[PDB]
Amino acid sequence: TPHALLLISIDGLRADMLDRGITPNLSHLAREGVRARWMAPSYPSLAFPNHYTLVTGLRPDHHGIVHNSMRDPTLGGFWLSKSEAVGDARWWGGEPVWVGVENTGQHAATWSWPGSEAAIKGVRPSQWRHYQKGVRLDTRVDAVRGWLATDGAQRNRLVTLYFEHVDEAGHDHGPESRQYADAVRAVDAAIGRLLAGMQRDGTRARTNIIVVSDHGMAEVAPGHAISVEDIAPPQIATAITDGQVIGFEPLPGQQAAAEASVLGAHDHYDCWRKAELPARWQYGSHPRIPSLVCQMHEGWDALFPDKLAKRAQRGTRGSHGYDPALPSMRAVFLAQGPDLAQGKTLPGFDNVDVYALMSRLLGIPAAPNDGNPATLLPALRMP
Ligand SMILES: [Zn+2]
Ligand SMILES: [Zn+2]
C-alpha cells in the first residue's frame, strides 16, 4: 500500500519555539526528518485564510477566505462560530487536498481543518467532524490513531489534525508567557502519545508526517488596545472586522470623506486602499476585502467599542494578524516519514509551497496554485 499523510497544525506555534527545550517530541521529529528554519504565513496572518492556503496552495486573495470574518453581498456574513457559513461551500475557492484525494478514489479523514465541514467542489472527506471547542487531547488523538489504522479500500490516505491550545494561550498571556510554553509542552506531549500509539498500532512507519503552524505570535503589552472607532467614526465608515486587520467600508455618501482621516500612517497603525496595499502582501484584489484596510502595528490591537470595555484590564497579552514578514509572525514547518528525508534542514520559505509537496505525497495532481513545486523537493528522499 502507498504511504499515508498525517498533516498536523499547531495553531500559533511560532518558528523559534522549536528551539527552547519545550518540544521534546517535535524536536525528535526534526532529528528524524526535515525542519524548515521558518515558514512565512500569507496575508492576513489569521487562522482560516492560512489553514486554507496550506491545503490549496493559493493565497487568501485567490481562494476567497480573506479573513476569519467577512461579508459578501451574495453569501452574507462569515465568522468562525457561524456554522452555516463555514460549512457552506460557496465561500471556499480552489480545491483543497482532501477533495483531490477523494476524487482519485482514495480517502480523507479530517479531525478539524478549516473547510472540512463544507462540500467544496461537491465533495466532503470520507471521515469528518463539526468543530467544537474543549474537545479533550486524548479524544482527538485516538480517533486520528484509529483513522490511520483502518485497513483495506477504506484506508485513509490523508489524516488531518488541529490543535487550538497554543494560539489560545498566546492570546490571553502572550508568547513569552509561562502559559504559552506550558501549552506548547501540552500539545507536544499529546503529539508524543499519538506517535507512540501509531508505533504500537504499526502505522508509524507506514505514515508520512507534516507539522505546520498557520502563523507565529507577538507580545501585546497591557493597555495596547484602542478602539476601531479611534481610526474611523461610525457616520463615516463601518469597521467590518477588528483585531489587527481592520477593514472599513465607507457609508454610501462618505466615499471621499473616509479617505481623509484614515489613509496613510498613524502612531500604531497604517491604512491603505485595498488596491494599493503593500505589493509584497499579495492581497487587495478579491472583492470581499473591504475597501480600506488598516494594519495594526505589531503589539497593538484595535477592538469594537463594546469589545474594548470588557478587555482584560492589566495583563500582558498576545496577537498575530500582523505583517506576515515580521519574524514574530513566522510559522513552523517540519516533516518526517518513509518518503521524507532524514536529518535535513530547509531555508525559510513561503507557505504557498506546502501544497505541491502534499499533492506529491497524496498521489493527486496539483490543481493550479500560487506556489512553486521546486522549493520543497529537497524535503524528499527521492528526486
Ligand atoms: Zn491561528
Ligand atoms: Zn489566534
Numbering used by the authors: 44 to 426
Give passages from the manuscript.
Since ENPP1 is part of the highly conserved nucleotide pyrophosphatase/phosphodiesterase (NPP) protein family, we investigated the evolutionary conservation of the analogous histidine residue and its requirement for cGAMP degradation. Two zinc ions are required for NPP’s catalytic activity, with Zn1 being particularly important for stabilizing the leaving group, whereas Zn2 activates the threonine nucleophile. We found that Xac NPP not only degrades cyclic dinucleotides but also prefers 2′-5′–linked over 3′-5′–linked cyclic dinucleotides.
As mouse ENPP1 is technically challenging to crystallize, we took advantage of the conservation between Xac NPP and mouse ENPP1 to solve the cocrystal structure of Xac NPP in complex with cGAMP. To prevent cGAMP hydrolysis, we mutated the catalytic threonine to alanine (Xac NPP T90A), crystalized it with cGAMP, and obtained a 1.9 Å crystal structure. Similar to the previous mouse ENPP1 T238A structure, we found a linear 3′-5′–linked pApG intermediate bound to NPP instead of intact cGAMP. This discrepancy suggests that the guanine ring is flexible and mobile, which explains why mutating the guanosine-adjacent site did not disrupt cGAMP hydrolysis. Using cGAMP as a competitive inhibitor of the ENPP1-ATP reaction, we determined that ENPP1WT and ENPP1H362A have very similar Ki values, demonstrating that ENPP1H362A binds cGAMP equally well as ENPP1WT. Together, our structural and biochemical data demonstrate that H362 is not necessary for binding cGAMP.
